[PDB]
């Protein structure tokens, strides 16, 4: 995808983790209160798959929007998932 494009990924966890760290939420000072990928963990699921990178925004998880989510809410939504997770993203700028 190019920056701004929507894309989706079915991501299988490794070690019960998606392999990303996230930042943001309506209660933070991060751009728009959005949920962004802050880092991709070495050897983790996101890295191995290769579609998600730092700066990508997470819009939804398993069909439910992360809009209006606090940081804690979004993190819980991301964690309260099974072994494979459907994620909807906006491509960031590298």
């Amino acid at each position: 995808p190019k920056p701004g494009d929507i894309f989706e990924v079915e991501l299988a966890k490794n070690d019960n983790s998606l392999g990303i760290s996230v930042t943001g939420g309506v209660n933070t000072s991060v751009r728009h209160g959005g949920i962004y990928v802050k880092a991709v963990i070495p050897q983790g699921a996101a890295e191995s798959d290769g579609r998600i990178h730092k700066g990508d925004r997470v819009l939804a998880v398993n069909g439910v929007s992360l809009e209006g989510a606090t940081h804690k809410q979004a993190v819980e939504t991301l964690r309260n998932t099974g072994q494979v997770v459907h994620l909807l993203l906006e491509k960031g700028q590298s």
Binding site: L18, S21, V22, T23
Partner: peptide, 6 residues
């Protein structure tokens, strides 16, 4: 400023 592992 909050960063969390998922």
């Amino acid at each position: 400023e909050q960063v969390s592992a998922v």
